[PDB]
XYZ file of C-alpha atoms in Angstrom:
728
model
C -20.753 -75.051 -153.487
C -23.275 -73.494 -155.876
C -26.594 -72.805 -153.993
C -28.743 -74.558 -156.610
C -26.870 -77.701 -155.751
C -27.356 -77.413 -151.959
C -30.742 -75.710 -152.122
C -32.348 -77.729 -154.882
C -35.706 -77.073 -153.210
C -34.897 -73.435 -154.017
C -34.500 -74.301 -157.720
C -38.018 -75.893 -157.750
C -39.620 -72.991 -155.812
C -37.905 -70.535 -158.161
C -39.389 -72.463 -161.115
C -42.760 -73.884 -160.000
C -45.904 -72.473 -158.552
C -46.409 -73.731 -154.993
C -45.300 -72.996 -151.498
C -41.889 -73.467 -149.911
C -40.997 -73.117 -146.185
C -37.518 -73.170 -144.600
C -36.629 -72.800 -140.960
C -33.538 -70.803 -140.088
C -31.252 -73.149 -138.140
C -27.867 -71.703 -137.136
C -27.597 -69.341 -140.120
C -28.760 -71.967 -142.599
C -32.072 -72.655 -144.436
C -33.501 -76.082 -143.665
C -36.638 -77.279 -145.481
C -39.659 -77.961 -143.281
C -41.360 -81.282 -144.167
C -44.320 -80.537 -146.475
C -46.985 -82.131 -144.323
C -45.955 -79.858 -141.485
C -46.453 -76.567 -143.288
C -48.340 -74.443 -140.761
C -46.403 -75.677 -137.751
C -44.042 -73.038 -136.393
C -41.577 -73.113 -133.500
C -42.024 -70.068 -131.352
C -38.307 -69.770 -130.627
C -37.297 -69.850 -134.272
C -37.656 -67.737 -137.429
C -38.621 -69.063 -140.881
C -38.608 -67.989 -144.517
C -41.603 -68.558 -146.754
C -41.514 -68.331 -150.546
C -44.830 -68.342 -152.370
C -44.587 -68.708 -156.128
C -47.621 -67.681 -158.158
C -48.116 -68.318 -161.899
C -49.148 -65.151 -163.745
C -51.431 -66.130 -166.749
C -48.804 -65.159 -169.279
C -46.948 -68.110 -167.750
C -44.401 -66.020 -165.851
C -43.782 -66.504 -162.165
C -44.290 -64.092 -159.286
C -42.673 -64.218 -155.839
C -43.732 -63.290 -152.368
C -40.961 -63.660 -149.778
C -42.071 -63.658 -146.187
C -39.985 -64.066 -143.100
C -41.739 -64.962 -139.881
C -40.481 -64.320 -136.339
C -41.751 -66.220 -133.315
C -42.151 -64.529 -129.936
C -39.068 -66.170 -128.351
C -36.793 -65.360 -131.237
C -33.251 -64.055 -130.676
C -32.113 -60.868 -132.461
C -29.610 -63.068 -134.272
C -32.240 -65.574 -135.500
C -34.438 -62.826 -136.886
C -31.271 -61.312 -138.258
C -30.592 -64.347 -140.368
C -34.193 -64.521 -141.516
C -34.031 -60.925 -142.663
C -30.667 -61.637 -144.375
C -31.864 -64.641 -146.338
C -34.960 -62.673 -147.346
C -32.865 -59.900 -148.925
C -30.441 -62.398 -150.469
C -33.162 -64.638 -151.874
C -34.852 -61.660 -153.497
C -31.401 -61.209 -154.987
C -31.378 -64.624 -156.694
C -34.794 -63.721 -158.116
C -33.532 -60.499 -159.684
C -35.043 -58.022 -157.179
C -38.539 -58.788 -158.327
C -40.000 -60.387 -155.182
C -42.296 -58.729 -152.698
C -40.915 -59.046 -149.174
C -42.916 -59.398 -145.960
C -41.930 -59.127 -142.317
C -44.356 -61.278 -140.309
C -44.636 -61.539 -136.511
C -46.254 -64.322 -134.523
C -49.839 -63.334 -133.810
C -50.167 -60.455 -136.316
C -49.063 -61.836 -139.651
C -50.497 -60.451 -142.941
C -53.765 -61.497 -144.588
C -51.621 -62.684 -147.553
C -49.432 -64.813 -145.330
C -52.499 -66.168 -143.509
C -54.075 -67.195 -146.805
C -51.401 -69.846 -147.453
C -52.530 -71.867 -144.406
C -56.230 -72.449 -144.264
C -56.117 -75.481 -142.001
C -54.663 -72.731 -139.681
C -51.358 -72.107 -137.862
C -49.742 -73.932 -134.941
C -47.400 -72.080 -132.637
C -45.276 -74.609 -130.756
C -43.033 -74.253 -127.676
C -39.332 -74.682 -128.368
C -36.760 -73.826 -131.005
C -33.274 -74.736 -132.260
C -31.633 -73.373 -129.116
C -33.613 -75.890 -127.058
C -32.990 -78.821 -129.386
C -36.294 -79.120 -131.188
C -36.851 -80.134 -134.777
C -39.763 -80.827 -137.103
C -39.771 -84.644 -137.360
C -42.607 -87.083 -138.362
C -40.830 -90.573 -138.616
C -42.879 -92.918 -136.326
C -42.221 -93.196 -132.535
C -44.643 -90.665 -130.955
C -45.012 -90.206 -127.167
C -46.778 -86.872 -126.969
C -48.510 -84.745 -124.344
C -49.326 -81.274 -125.668
C -52.038 -78.718 -125.111
C -53.175 -76.207 -127.725
C -55.391 -73.201 -127.202
C -57.444 -72.613 -130.373
C -58.506 -69.035 -130.847
C -60.037 -66.852 -133.555
C -62.894 -66.806 -136.065
C -61.459 -66.382 -139.562
C -57.816 -66.109 -138.587
C -57.594 -69.441 -136.663
C -54.507 -69.937 -134.494
C -53.579 -72.912 -132.276
C -51.070 -71.948 -129.581
C -49.171 -74.535 -127.515
C -49.793 -74.017 -123.816
C -48.892 -75.555 -120.414
C -50.605 -78.922 -119.846
C -52.781 -77.639 -117.024
C -56.393 -76.644 -116.263
C -54.934 -73.213 -115.474
C -54.467 -72.926 -119.299
C -58.191 -73.436 -119.956
C -61.211 -71.089 -120.162
C -64.969 -71.361 -120.984
C -64.732 -69.358 -124.233
C -62.167 -71.208 -126.337
C -61.435 -74.644 -127.716
C -58.596 -76.848 -126.655
C -56.827 -79.783 -128.100
C -55.049 -82.157 -125.739
C -52.795 -84.122 -128.025
C -51.997 -87.498 -126.533
C -50.374 -89.351 -129.489
C -52.787 -92.126 -130.580
C -55.631 -90.011 -129.224
C -56.431 -86.361 -129.824
C -58.934 -84.779 -127.430
C -60.830 -81.767 -128.735
C -62.535 -79.791 -126.032
C -64.947 -76.899 -126.368
C -65.767 -74.234 -123.806
C -69.397 -73.981 -122.721
C -69.201 -70.365 -123.930
C -67.415 -71.227 -127.184
C -69.462 -70.180 -130.186
C -70.509 -72.934 -132.643
C -68.452 -71.447 -135.487
C -65.213 -71.505 -133.435
C -65.639 -75.234 -132.699
C -66.007 -75.871 -136.402
C -62.588 -74.265 -136.954
C -60.888 -76.175 -134.103
C -61.857 -79.449 -135.808
C -59.501 -78.533 -138.677
C -56.561 -78.373 -136.261
C -57.444 -81.731 -134.726
C -57.896 -83.357 -138.118
C -54.631 -81.814 -139.288
C -52.781 -83.399 -136.385
C -54.497 -86.703 -137.157
C -53.803 -86.621 -140.919
C -50.444 -84.833 -141.266
C -48.631 -85.612 -138.016
C -50.067 -89.087 -137.298
C -50.462 -90.142 -140.969
C -54.209 -90.870 -140.603
C -53.818 -93.341 -137.737
C -55.150 -91.795 -134.474
C -58.503 -91.079 -132.903
C -60.014 -87.627 -132.564
C -62.255 -87.679 -129.502
C -64.512 -84.597 -129.126
C -66.172 -83.209 -125.977
C -67.257 -80.157 -123.960
C -67.377 -79.070 -120.276
C -68.871 -81.769 -118.067
C -68.240 -84.561 -120.625
C -64.423 -84.887 -120.530
C -63.066 -88.478 -120.814
C -61.017 -90.385 -118.241
C -57.880 -89.840 -120.369
C -58.299 -86.108 -120.127
C -59.104 -86.196 -116.389
C -56.132 -88.483 -115.749
C -53.489 -86.063 -117.142
C -55.140 -82.808 -116.104
C -56.578 -83.767 -112.705
C -60.139 -83.043 -111.512
C -61.702 -79.953 -113.209
C -62.021 -76.670 -111.316
C -64.205 -73.720 -112.264
C -62.743 -72.005 -115.311
C -62.727 -68.283 -116.174
C -64.328 -66.597 -119.229
C -62.712 -65.870 -122.665
C -60.676 -62.948 -124.124
C -61.776 -61.709 -127.556
C -59.424 -52.110 -137.900
C -61.730 -49.132 -137.068
C -61.621 -45.574 -138.480
C -57.827 -45.785 -138.386
C -58.122 -47.020 -142.007
C -58.650 -43.682 -143.670
C -55.454 -41.650 -143.208
C -51.965 -42.420 -144.458
C -48.793 -40.433 -145.182
C -45.893 -40.840 -147.629
C -42.213 -40.246 -146.806
C -38.903 -40.136 -148.679
C -35.938 -41.906 -147.086
C -32.349 -40.639 -146.981
C -29.723 -43.069 -145.539
C -30.106 -46.829 -145.309
C -26.580 -46.247 -146.630
C -25.852 -44.740 -143.157
C -28.319 -43.547 -140.504
C -32.066 -43.054 -141.084
C -33.770 -39.669 -141.699
C -37.104 -39.029 -143.462
C -38.973 -36.260 -145.248
C -42.731 -35.821 -145.494
C -43.726 -35.772 -149.186
C -47.475 -36.065 -148.905
C -49.489 -35.634 -145.736
C -52.817 -36.921 -147.097
C -54.021 -39.710 -149.387
C -54.779 -40.187 -152.201
C -51.141 -39.500 -153.188
C -49.732 -38.380 -156.547
C -48.069 -41.315 -158.344
C -45.409 -38.846 -159.564
C -44.343 -38.327 -155.938
C -42.657 -41.730 -156.297
C -39.217 -41.016 -157.792
C -37.024 -43.896 -159.092
C -33.748 -42.618 -157.656
C -35.200 -42.895 -154.137
C -36.934 -45.103 -151.593
C -40.191 -44.138 -149.932
C -42.167 -45.226 -146.899
C -45.925 -45.280 -147.060
C -47.028 -45.167 -143.456
C -50.385 -46.760 -142.556
C -49.086 -47.657 -139.090
C -52.188 -46.630 -137.165
C -53.827 -49.414 -139.203
C -50.876 -51.739 -138.461
C -48.979 -51.675 -141.779
C -46.121 -49.873 -143.464
C -44.806 -50.182 -147.010
C -41.336 -49.627 -148.373
C -41.131 -48.804 -152.088
C -37.766 -49.169 -153.846
C -37.158 -47.150 -157.003
C -35.380 -49.113 -159.747
C -32.671 -46.462 -159.635
C -32.007 -46.227 -155.881
C -28.521 -47.428 -154.966
C -27.817 -51.009 -153.929
C -26.845 -50.045 -150.376
C -30.234 -48.361 -150.126
C -32.357 -51.225 -151.550
C -30.617 -53.952 -149.593
C -31.210 -52.034 -146.334
C -34.974 -51.699 -146.821
C -35.912 -54.012 -143.948
C -33.566 -52.160 -141.585
C -35.060 -48.824 -142.717
C -38.562 -50.154 -142.017
C -37.488 -51.119 -138.450
C -35.910 -47.752 -137.768
C -39.057 -46.022 -138.947
C -41.255 -48.147 -136.652
C -39.005 -47.176 -133.717
C -38.781 -43.484 -134.687
C -42.601 -43.285 -134.854
C -43.118 -45.397 -131.740
C -45.419 -47.897 -133.501
C -46.016 -51.412 -132.122
C -43.145 -53.839 -132.888
C -45.550 -56.322 -134.466
C -46.468 -53.749 -137.183
C -46.405 -55.371 -140.632
C -43.777 -54.461 -143.183
C -43.846 -54.860 -146.949
C -41.057 -53.975 -149.317
C -42.002 -53.549 -152.980
C -39.853 -53.037 -156.047
C -40.712 -50.362 -158.666
C -42.973 -52.061 -161.218
C -44.046 -54.809 -158.801
C -46.501 -52.943 -156.579
C -49.387 -54.757 -154.906
C -53.027 -53.625 -155.420
C -53.323 -52.529 -151.789
C -50.283 -50.290 -152.303
C -51.463 -48.737 -155.565
C -54.897 -47.894 -154.138
C -53.345 -45.163 -151.971
C -52.806 -43.120 -155.179
C -54.902 -40.972 -157.599
C -55.445 -43.201 -160.651
C -52.394 -45.484 -160.713
C -51.280 -45.862 -164.334
C -48.396 -48.272 -164.991
C -46.944 -46.943 -168.339
C -47.547 -50.098 -170.421
C -50.500 -52.284 -169.279
C -53.458 -52.112 -171.567
C -51.372 -54.512 -173.598
C -50.428 -57.817 -171.946
C -52.452 -60.158 -169.791
C -52.629 -58.932 -166.206
C -50.643 -56.282 -164.295
C -47.890 -55.413 -161.764
C -49.083 -58.113 -159.392
C -51.570 -60.963 -159.236
C -53.137 -61.373 -155.801
C -52.521 -64.912 -154.657
C -56.148 -65.484 -153.641
C -57.463 -65.067 -157.216
C -54.488 -66.696 -158.988
C -56.710 -69.712 -159.680
C -59.748 -67.878 -161.017
C -60.395 -68.650 -164.697
C -61.335 -65.425 -166.503
C -64.566 -66.064 -168.398
C -65.679 -63.535 -171.069
C -69.275 -62.359 -171.408
C -71.697 -64.447 -173.489
C -75.437 -63.819 -173.115
C -76.422 -67.274 -174.418
C -74.359 -69.204 -171.831
C -74.740 -66.734 -168.962
C -77.610 -68.706 -167.507
C -75.031 -71.540 -167.029
C -72.053 -69.716 -165.497
C -72.154 -68.259 -162.032
C -68.472 -67.498 -162.728
C -69.563 -65.208 -165.592
C -72.348 -63.678 -163.497
C -69.894 -62.726 -160.763
C -67.175 -61.487 -163.074
C -69.458 -59.168 -165.046
C -71.921 -58.054 -162.361
C -74.802 -59.547 -164.327
C -77.357 -61.741 -162.621
C -78.990 -62.323 -166.024
C -79.354 -60.757 -169.499
C -81.965 -58.359 -168.057
C -84.885 -59.300 -170.271
C -87.161 -60.568 -167.448
C -90.333 -58.965 -166.020
C -90.029 -55.657 -164.188
C -92.165 -53.044 -162.453
C -90.873 -49.424 -162.109
C -92.138 -46.848 -159.567
C -91.391 -43.187 -158.939
C -91.661 -41.872 -155.388
C -94.132 -39.044 -154.959
C -94.373 -37.990 -151.348
C -94.477 -41.243 -149.412
C -95.920 -43.454 -152.130
C -94.881 -45.601 -155.051
C -96.319 -44.256 -158.305
C -96.129 -46.477 -161.449
C -93.948 -45.002 -164.184
C -95.326 -44.743 -167.706
C -94.393 -48.046 -169.477
C -93.559 -46.002 -172.596
C -90.807 -44.172 -170.650
C -89.213 -47.182 -168.934
C -85.500 -46.400 -169.238
C -85.694 -42.697 -168.595
C -84.859 -41.441 -165.107
C -84.884 -37.895 -163.798
C -82.391 -36.549 -161.293
C -85.150 -34.770 -159.380
C -86.799 -38.110 -158.622
C -86.153 -41.361 -156.796
C -87.229 -44.744 -158.080
C -87.771 -48.345 -157.152
C -87.444 -51.038 -159.818
C -88.689 -54.528 -158.953
C -86.972 -57.098 -161.167
C -87.388 -60.841 -161.712
C -84.181 -62.631 -162.752
C -83.571 -66.223 -163.950
C -80.262 -68.074 -163.714
C -79.453 -71.765 -163.453
C -83.010 -73.084 -163.506
C -83.855 -70.954 -160.448
C -85.794 -67.610 -160.237
C -85.014 -64.658 -157.895
C -85.862 -60.973 -157.344
C -83.881 -57.732 -157.198
C -85.137 -54.423 -155.922
C -83.191 -51.479 -157.254
C -83.481 -48.196 -155.301
C -82.312 -45.376 -157.591
C -81.675 -42.040 -155.861
C -81.580 -38.881 -158.002
C -78.725 -36.493 -157.290
C -81.303 -33.727 -157.012
C -84.100 -35.650 -155.279
C -85.318 -34.085 -152.032
C -84.079 -35.779 -148.807
C -87.634 -36.557 -147.736
C -88.193 -38.442 -150.978
C -84.754 -40.153 -151.095
C -85.416 -41.375 -147.568
C -88.994 -42.364 -148.470
C -87.640 -44.476 -151.317
C -85.186 -46.182 -148.950
C -87.997 -47.109 -146.528
C -90.357 -48.217 -149.348
C -87.624 -50.431 -150.762
C -87.291 -52.171 -147.402
C -91.052 -52.538 -147.115
C -91.294 -54.158 -150.529
C -88.611 -56.629 -149.504
C -90.465 -57.326 -146.224
C -93.696 -58.103 -147.995
C -92.032 -60.182 -150.702
C -90.956 -62.532 -147.912
C -87.630 -60.921 -146.925
C -85.835 -62.567 -149.879
C -85.281 -60.174 -152.783
C -81.817 -58.728 -153.209
C -81.919 -55.041 -152.328
C -79.647 -52.692 -154.182
C -79.143 -48.945 -153.534
C -77.809 -47.035 -156.514
C -77.057 -43.334 -156.677
C -77.468 -41.271 -159.833
C -74.464 -41.501 -162.125
C -73.065 -44.737 -160.670
C -75.489 -47.314 -162.062
C -74.317 -50.923 -161.592
C -73.810 -52.894 -164.849
C -76.921 -55.049 -164.482
C -79.304 -52.108 -164.031
C -78.373 -50.651 -167.445
C -79.233 -53.906 -169.176
C -82.896 -53.922 -168.272
C -84.373 -51.901 -171.146
C -84.508 -54.043 -174.321
C -81.848 -52.637 -176.604
C -82.506 -49.020 -175.553
C -80.057 -47.106 -173.378
C -80.775 -46.199 -169.774
C -81.211 -42.398 -170.016
C -80.453 -40.235 -166.979
C -81.386 -36.559 -166.921
C -79.588 -34.062 -164.754
C -82.653 -33.052 -162.731
C -86.309 -32.728 -163.658
C -89.231 -34.889 -162.664
C -91.444 -37.235 -164.623
C -94.339 -36.844 -162.101
C -97.678 -35.672 -163.439
C -97.320 -32.550 -161.283
C -94.702 -30.333 -162.862
C -92.867 -30.999 -166.089
C -90.171 -28.307 -166.484
C -88.299 -26.841 -169.457
C -85.040 -28.513 -170.642
C -81.698 -26.694 -170.312
C -80.557 -24.742 -173.415
C -77.263 -26.630 -174.063
C -77.107 -30.251 -172.711
C -74.249 -32.807 -172.726
C -74.776 -36.574 -172.389
C -72.110 -39.241 -171.758
C -72.796 -42.610 -173.347
C -70.937 -45.424 -171.574
C -71.342 -49.153 -172.398
C -70.774 -52.281 -170.354
C -69.278 -55.769 -170.865
C -72.689 -56.821 -172.138
C -72.997 -54.111 -174.761
C -75.885 -52.303 -173.023
C -75.389 -48.562 -172.634
C -76.341 -45.702 -170.391
C -76.550 -42.031 -171.332
C -75.765 -39.806 -168.369
C -76.442 -36.084 -168.598
C -73.451 -34.101 -167.379
C -72.280 -30.485 -167.131
C -71.898 -29.127 -170.678
C -68.140 -28.451 -170.411
C -65.221 -29.937 -172.379
C -63.611 -31.070 -169.103
C -66.417 -33.637 -168.866
C -65.278 -35.480 -171.999
C -63.863 -38.989 -172.185
C -61.975 -40.774 -174.970
C -63.657 -44.090 -174.159
C -67.270 -43.067 -174.672
C -69.692 -41.476 -177.098
C -71.202 -38.069 -176.265
C -74.392 -36.300 -177.295
C -74.410 -32.489 -177.201
C -77.654 -30.617 -177.695
C -77.615 -26.921 -178.481
C -80.508 -24.689 -179.645
C -78.534 -24.444 -182.895
C -77.894 -28.167 -183.696
C -77.056 -31.642 -182.278
C -73.634 -33.342 -182.136
C -72.868 -37.051 -181.716
C -69.174 -36.964 -180.750
C -67.514 -40.400 -180.981
C -64.363 -40.939 -178.929
C -61.469 -42.985 -180.310
C -62.155 -45.583 -177.578
C -65.898 -45.776 -178.340
C -67.212 -48.937 -180.007
C -70.275 -49.740 -182.128
C -72.424 -50.270 -178.992
C -71.747 -46.716 -177.771
C -72.464 -45.231 -181.220
C -75.793 -47.082 -181.514
C -76.719 -46.284 -177.904
C -76.132 -42.600 -178.514
C -78.378 -42.366 -181.578
C -81.248 -44.134 -179.845
C -80.983 -41.202 -177.359
C -81.022 -38.710 -180.221
C -84.302 -40.325 -181.245
C -85.708 -39.618 -177.747
C -84.532 -35.977 -177.761
C -86.148 -35.757 -181.249
C -82.946 -34.297 -182.764
C -80.940 -34.978 -185.937
C -77.338 -36.139 -185.303
C -74.163 -34.678 -186.773
C -71.499 -37.441 -186.469
C -68.130 -36.017 -185.365
C -64.952 -38.020 -184.645
C -62.651 -37.074 -181.751
C -59.634 -34.882 -182.510
C -61.162 -33.350 -185.667
C -64.309 -31.488 -184.589
C -66.169 -28.457 -186.001
C -65.436 -25.317 -183.891
C -69.204 -24.741 -183.473
C -68.925 -27.754 -181.148
C -66.054 -26.290 -179.052
C -67.883 -22.988 -178.688
C -71.093 -24.782 -177.595
C -69.098 -26.184 -174.631
C -67.615 -22.790 -173.751
C -64.097 -23.335 -175.104
C -61.610 -26.209 -175.213
C -59.956 -27.437 -171.983
C -58.232 -30.763 -171.206
C -60.207 -33.969 -170.485
C -59.578 -37.702 -169.779
C -57.801 -39.810 -172.455
C -56.213 -42.735 -170.586
C -58.201 -45.986 -171.201
C -60.315 -47.935 -168.705
C -59.219 -51.190 -167.070
C -62.091 -53.350 -168.472
C -60.776 -56.920 -168.339
C -58.003 -55.956 -165.932
C -60.425 -54.468 -163.336
C -60.293 -57.742 -161.398
C -56.465 -57.673 -161.369
C -56.302 -54.110 -160.084
C -59.060 -54.601 -157.537
C -59.533 -58.234 -156.521
C -62.663 -59.008 -154.503
C -62.096 -58.872 -150.760
C -64.259 -60.415 -148.061
C -64.701 -58.798 -144.637
C -66.781 -59.514 -141.564
C -67.974 -56.404 -139.782
C -69.446 -55.448 -136.425
C -70.883 -52.507 -134.425
C -70.740 -53.659 -130.765
C -69.256 -50.998 -128.355
C -70.478 -48.110 -130.581
C -67.273 -48.681 -132.567
C -67.269 -49.960 -136.155
C -64.780 -52.758 -136.607
C -63.929 -54.865 -139.667
C -61.855 -58.016 -140.142
C -60.515 -59.199 -143.499
C -60.976 -62.933 -144.149
C -57.722 -64.163 -145.757
C -57.156 -66.406 -148.780
C -59.543 -67.856 -151.340
C -63.166 -66.907 -150.919
C -65.012 -69.910 -149.577
C -68.711 -70.335 -148.804
C -67.515 -71.883 -145.497
C -66.201 -68.407 -144.595
C -69.801 -67.081 -144.522
C -70.846 -67.512 -140.884
C -74.616 -67.563 -140.353
C -74.386 -65.285 -137.268
C -72.429 -62.657 -139.158
C -72.970 -59.761 -141.518
C -70.239 -59.973 -144.175
C -69.090 -57.578 -146.876
C -67.984 -58.769 -150.334
C -66.278 -55.818 -151.925
C -65.941 -55.987 -155.631
C -64.756 -52.630 -156.824
C -67.936 -51.646 -158.637
C -70.231 -52.718 -155.868
C -70.218 -53.705 -152.238
C -72.307 -56.770 -151.412
C -73.438 -57.090 -147.843
C -74.306 -60.658 -146.923
C -76.613 -61.049 -143.914
C -76.568 -64.361 -142.063
C -79.874 -65.680 -140.822
C -78.596 -65.751 -137.215
C -77.034 -62.284 -136.953
C -78.471 -59.759 -134.507
C -81.377 -57.421 -135.220
C -79.396 -54.174 -134.988
C -76.766 -55.718 -137.285
C -79.361 -56.805 -139.850
C -80.999 -53.345 -139.920
C -77.574 -51.595 -140.020
C -76.676 -53.705 -143.075
C -76.716 -50.641 -145.332
C -74.956 -48.273 -142.911
C -72.213 -50.824 -142.363
C -71.423 -50.849 -146.054
C -71.473 -47.017 -146.120
C -69.002 -46.965 -143.196
C -66.759 -49.489 -144.842
C -66.820 -47.282 -147.962
C -66.319 -43.972 -146.082
C -63.259 -45.303 -144.252
C -61.443 -46.999 -147.167
C -57.944 -45.442 -147.639
C -58.584 -45.499 -151.405
C -61.127 -42.640 -151.164
C -63.896 -44.619 -152.747
C -66.682 -42.834 -154.594
C -69.448 -42.243 -152.013
C -72.004 -43.092 -154.695
C -70.787 -46.739 -154.891
C -73.696 -49.147 -155.184
C -74.441 -51.292 -152.128
C -76.378 -54.527 -152.599
C -77.882 -56.336 -149.635
C -78.144 -60.061 -150.006
C -79.626 -62.702 -147.680
C -78.167 -66.079 -146.644
C -79.729 -68.800 -148.800
C -80.927 -66.340 -151.425
C -77.646 -65.040 -152.800
C -77.718 -64.009 -156.500
C -75.365 -65.477 -159.193
C -73.241 -62.283 -159.301
C -72.450 -63.038 -155.666
C -72.168 -66.845 -155.385
C -70.161 -66.840 -158.594
C -67.095 -65.496 -156.736
C -66.752 -68.484 -154.398
C -65.638 -71.632 -156.130
C -67.049 -74.621 -154.280
C -70.459 -73.009 -153.578
C -73.016 -75.716 -152.780
C -76.715 -74.902 -152.481
C -77.609 -77.446 -149.794
C -74.738 -76.276 -147.598
C -76.970 -74.802 -144.925
C -79.649 -77.524 -144.824
C -77.553 -79.458 -142.332
C -75.911 -77.306 -139.647
C -72.249 -76.847 -140.706
C -70.866 -77.937 -137.294
C -73.087 -81.048 -137.164
C -71.660 -82.040 -140.585
C -67.957 -81.543 -139.731
C -68.530 -83.439 -136.522
C -69.634 -86.702 -138.104
C -68.299 -87.106 -141.651
C -65.099 -84.965 -141.635
C -63.654 -86.205 -138.296
C -64.614 -89.508 -136.555
């Protein structure tokens, strides 16, 4: 028998986007009924194929296998086997995931946003997944977790209960949802999904969800559980993110040994040879990766999962540690970010990259258009532009502990010796909002940098606590800030001061980098006058006592050319146009010789593919900084009013502060972002802009990342809503 006859579900999954789940039953793959996706037997293992459509129309595969806690070695064996052999039928191009009950990957978790159910039983005890009528049930689920929401089947007893969690006592025609007196309001909201899911999927709409809390339990509940005793209380990353090591493997074709190849990230991409397999160990953060070179032998590549196991044992890591195997050419963004500038040899041509993260597979890529920007929060988000930047603005320089108004004639020029506050009014949709930019010169004195931080916060306070607050550090201006100065470029000088006090004298030979954005606005950044500071993508202006050069890189467009000559006007010099590759030698001598610089192009449109937006909740309690990734598609729902969240684009880190989060959390908003940035395994630029945003006053460049954003969402308490209209 063929396999495509016999697993025709496999044919569809191989050919259509969607999700397919089989349960391993006596060394066979048996489809799980669709409306039960999310239900898992704790004594079994399963195989999960997610098929994503790529944008060029091609299909991309994530294979996961999932082991329950009461799984036999032989069950998990089969699951591993099918995983390897399925990847085989898909021409070695799938990404493989080992997933363990309780600690499955953020990717895995994202497939099930009604949540997971972990049921008692398995094949060995004669249990199946089966809907067809005839339902005499008596089950108890403990619902636990805030973003990751898991419902675990537990003994039908008050001993199973506690004050801090939610419980569902499934009784067939009637589902009883119960909430601990110490259960937080957001957790109850989540538990309602589970209940509703049991009503809709398992009881085909026809059953009553009855909801209650301690002291108000129904007769039905009291009848099966007995009279209620006193219950106990509840049981709910760090700086283990930063460090990772890379290893070469010898023998999956025999017995495991490994060599250290890099002891600190970021790693050199060239360390990854095709003839071999490598392990990237991030085990202290709960994850390891296996990378298969396209040239490693078959014995080797088909033994990847086994190799991962051995490594976890050899290093004495927890058994629930996550494992990912990746084929050469099919690396995931999280993998590639461990390396110095990942360049996949082709990829400026083509739509997309190595991998499309499942959680943005749906996002329609909208190009930049100033005239329709005011209509597209999608475009706002995708381009980091809250508006076209032509609205009213005030600019101050910090002198001592005061805001001093900058000369309106010089709006656009910023000195590295100073620190600035720009107050900006933006307009998008039909609604108005405010942004306060805090620009910190690389040479500004600590007293003044700090003064500008405090003054920023005080301006926000007195503008009613609502403006967006954005810290930017010299040389890393966010896209929107550049676009605030008519058609002129934002000019940034290495380090003088514009204050009345003390004008200085300009340096003898000065080099400026002129970089443009999606919107065509440019910024000219003064840099060290060395050839090693050159870039093929941008225009450059070099000023020497002798003359003035306007060097135009082969990547540079019209916008960069025109931006550069507007700067030449400011410097009061006369340009000498000079194309890259064929330059007068008076130029090369002005830079002190010719060394090598950067030629490889920038990601531009593919930035989103390489670095999809990721949402985290973060927390300080215990004097320990802890973060939790929220899995799957970014939803407004995921923004809990008693939380401080982080939306990480690549270019910026938004921190969202909920109205009901704690004081220390709200005032640590900035430091939290800095800590998230400091600890990232990618070695993020410490200058990365941070933008603090308030619940109910989010800007377009933020809301535009969540499809389904509704502005009245918070007017009625979220839990009060879900109570009535969603359930019964």
